[PDB]
């Protein structure tokens, strides 16, 4: 029997950690030399599907051939490879799939797709990850969006800031991310005044001209509010922000403190879990999401002798490439599309007794006005260069509402 106590209001507390990731993982102007043969092959696949009437590198195509499954004839289903109308079928009985072979093109499986716009994205991501897994990280970070050009302005209340106050990490899905107030080296900045005037003010530059065409579709900027010593999982808990608007974000710290171990299966420190944490290089606190990615990466190395690119890699292991482990495409597919292994890891991982959420309300408005667009863009371009349009500049106003916390504490009674 535990007692539940609710207390909402306003109090002085530390400002949430603001993680800033760009939509595209890398700049196309600095990575086109690495994705030259892939993009040249992707344009050929588009021409084969869109306008068939109107050299290539088949070493990339033979890794995962995008085939067409024409099964509208129940007595004769056929599978045709893309590489007197010569159009490609798009009727109700036809479909497009990816042929994933395991051992010498014998144990080949099909990842079926109904629309071509989805199969082309999944095929390009699988081929791009194959190239991004065989390049060192020290070289893979410099070919992404730097913090000097993204963060054009930073003003937390009355104290200014710049790209040097943002901790730079490399999220393998969104490239270089920047955390405003993390708290690993210096103490977290508290805020005791609600309102946009006392909150965080940011002016970000989203360069859409350097986006990867076949990899990054959305032209926004990812934002996440998390704790001070927690790893930012952008794909799970992450919001967007339109380009050319002022996104006001009112934060509300909604906490829930569980009773303890003898009353609920929750951990405090996080060292009681059996699986080892692969995020130990960041010195962050325990997180349930970090345990779900450490088990999957451990199961990934267990089946095939390689680790995925979208997850941390232990010391001594190697990422999944095509020149070393050609079976990683079938290996990763059998582990991603498997609800059985997902349920096993959830049972092994435990939750934290003190969880924290941020019930944030998003309100946007067109920031660059017709009267202020002249001098604003002239100042920002003068500081960056010595290139900016409505699609580039992003305005963010993060702050606390009238009530900034809502704690639900459980007490033994």
């Amino acid at each position: 029997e535990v007692s539940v106590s609710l207390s909402v209001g306003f109090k002085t507390m530390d400002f949430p950690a603001v993680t800033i990731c760009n939509a595209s993982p890398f700049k196309y102007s600095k990575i086109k030399h690495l994705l030259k043969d892939l993009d040249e092959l992707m344009e050929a696949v588009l021409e084969r599907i869109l306008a068939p009437e109107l050299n290539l590198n088949f070493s990339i195509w033979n890794h995962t051939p995008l085939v067409l499954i024409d099964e509208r004839n129940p007595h004769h289903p056929m599978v045709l490879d893309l590489f007197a109308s010569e159009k490609i079928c798009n009727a109700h009985g036809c479909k497009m799939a990816m042929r994933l072979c395991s051992l010498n093109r014998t144990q080949c499986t099909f990842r079926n797709f109904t629309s071509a716009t989805q199969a082309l994205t999944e095929w390009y991501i699988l081929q791009a990850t194959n190239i991004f897994a065989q390049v060192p990280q020290q070289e893979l970070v410099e070919m992404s969006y730097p913090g000097e050009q993204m963060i054009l302005a930073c003003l937390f209340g009355a104290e200014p800031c710049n790209y040097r106050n943002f901790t730079s990490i490399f999220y393998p899905h969104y490239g270089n991310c920047y955390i405003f107030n993390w708290g690993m080296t210096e103490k977290a900045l508290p805020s005791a005044n609600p309102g946009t005037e006392f909150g965080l003010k940011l002016i970000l530059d989203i360069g859409q001209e350097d986006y990867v065409p076949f990899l990054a579709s959305t032209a926004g900027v990812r934002l996440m509010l998390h704790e001070q010593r927690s790893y930012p999982f952008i794909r799970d808990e992450g919001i967007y922000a339109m380009s050319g608007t002022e996104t006001s974000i009112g934060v509300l710290v909604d906490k829930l403190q569980r009773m303890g171990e003898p009353y609920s299966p929750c951990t405090v420190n996080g060292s009681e879990v059996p699986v080892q944490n692969f995020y130990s290089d960041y010195n962050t606190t325990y997180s349930i999401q970090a345990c779900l990615r450490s088990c999957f990466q451990d199961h990934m190395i267990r089946n095939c002798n390689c680790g995925h690119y979208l997850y941390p890699l232990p010391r001594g292991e190697k990422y999944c490439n095509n020149r070393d482990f050609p079976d990683w495409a079938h290996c990763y597919s059998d582990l991603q599309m498997s609800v059985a292994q997902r349920e096993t890891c959830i049972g092994m991982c435990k939750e934290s007794c003190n969880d924290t959420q941020y019930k944030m309300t998003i309100s946007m408005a067109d920031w660059p006005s017709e009267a202020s667009e002249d001098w604003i863009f002239h100042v920002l371009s003068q500081e960056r260069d010595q290139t900016l349009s409505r699609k580039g500049i992003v305005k963010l106003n993060i702050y606390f509402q009238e009530f900034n916390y809502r704690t639900i504490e459980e007490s033994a009674a």
Binding site: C154, A158, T196, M364, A365, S369, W375, H378, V379
Partner: protein
């Protein structure tokens, strides 16, 4: 104590809606004082950023920021900024606040149709609210504000059934060309829903609006009731708190905090802050009357944020805490098949000059998501 969560199925009174525009109206009284301020800013941009379109605190590059000092010019410190956008905005704001306190203390005598030019249509629960009593006040950072369904209005808006059809429907005008481009750098409008008696804190619970989209705002009412005295330290009045309530409203957490900070602003710096109400005798701040008030205000925030003034300990929490969660659903309001007659209708009635580049006018819908709002009440055990 013991927490008891329940749902109240009663006639939901519609909260007061504060509608503010995003362009501060420059008064003709301070037109000569503002044109001089713009000339100093245009000269500042041309000297620093070469942008071609005597004040006590000039903006200079050292970063870019203005110097703040005390009376005897002993503890001088520079308030620097990273970019010129934030530097010019805050520097213009500081001088705009000082010259805004020089306005006369008399009531306006020139009745101008300032509401009809902003609100193109009002309709609550299939009933027009164009001819309704409201309260007008000019926010420094934002524009003119209009609060509807206030305590002073006898006709209280009652929401019978939840949904968009039985809620507030507004159509505001987002002026693309602001009166002050050096300070107003955002187009749209703000809407804040608060209690019938509670004041309007546009910085705390403001909700921006994009020009040219229909924003259906769903309100979820959340209230918390707790006992006071021996069970808790909450207060159901302002007599228990020694802080004098400066707002003409009931007791609230932020109302007492703003009042407690304003008293410390008057005792130390000698002048009252503009963004907060003032008593009948103390006047607002101005660099001509008070030689140095920005330095005293900056150092006051340092002591206030460190809980040195004691405003967080003196201001207790109210026993009745009501909140409104806002969830919006956006959609482009001008349809390509209706821009012909809709934009032409506004040009005939409201004389709205249609602009093919940007939309301008924006529609807003406010309503309750659920009729049974959650009520959290505590009970002894």
């Amino acid at each position: 104590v013991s927490l008891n969560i329940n749902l109240n199925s009663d006639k939901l009174v519609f909260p007061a809606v504060t509608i503010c525009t995003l362009n501060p109206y420059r008064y003709p009284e301070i037109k000569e004082e503002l044109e001089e301020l713009d000339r100093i800013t245009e000269q500042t941009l041309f000297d620093l950023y070469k942008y071609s379109s005597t004040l006590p605190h000039p903006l200079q590059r050292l970063k870019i920021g203005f110097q703040l000092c005390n009376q005897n010019k002993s503890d001088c410190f520079y308030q620097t900024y990273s970019s010129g956008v934030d530097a010019v905005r805050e520097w213009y704001r500081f001088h705009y606040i000082n010259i805004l306190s020089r306005l006369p203390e008399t009531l306006p005598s020139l009745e101008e149709d300032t509401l009809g030019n902003f609100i193109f249509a009002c309709r609550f629960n299939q009933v027009s609210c164009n001819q309704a009593n409201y309260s007008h006040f000019h926010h420094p950072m934002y524009g003119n504000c209009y609060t509807f369904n206030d305590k002073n209005n006898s006709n209280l808006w009652m929401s019978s059934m939840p949904g968009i059809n039985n809620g507030l429907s507004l159509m505001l005008r987002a002026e693309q060309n602001d009166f002050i481009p050096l300070l107003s750098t955002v187009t749209g409008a703000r809407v804040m829903v608060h209690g019938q008696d509670e004041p309007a804190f546009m910085d705390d619970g403001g909700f921006n609006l994009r020009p040219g989209v229909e924003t259906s705002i769903s309100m979820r009412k959340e209230t918390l009731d707790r006992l006071g005295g021996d069970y808790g330290d909450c207060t159901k009045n302002g007599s228990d708190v020694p802080v004098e309530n400066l707002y003409p409203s009931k007791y609230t957490q932020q109302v007492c905090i703003h009042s407690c900070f304003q008293e410390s602003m008057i005792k130390e710096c000698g002048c009252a802050y503009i963004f907060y109400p003032r008593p009948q005798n103390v006047e607002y701040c101005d660099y001509r009357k008070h030689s140095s008030w920005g330095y005293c205000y900056y150092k006051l925030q340092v002591d206030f944020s460190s809980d040195h003034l004691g405003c967080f300990t003196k201001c207790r929490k109210p026993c009745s805490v009501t909140s409104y969660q806002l969830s919006a659903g956006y959609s482009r309001w001008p349809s390509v098949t209706s821009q012909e007659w809709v934009f032409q209708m506004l040009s005939r009635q409201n004389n709205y000059t249609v602009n093919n580049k940007r939309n301008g006018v924006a529609k807003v819908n406010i309503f309750f998501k659920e009729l049974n709002y959650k009520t959290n009440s505590e009970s002894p055990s």
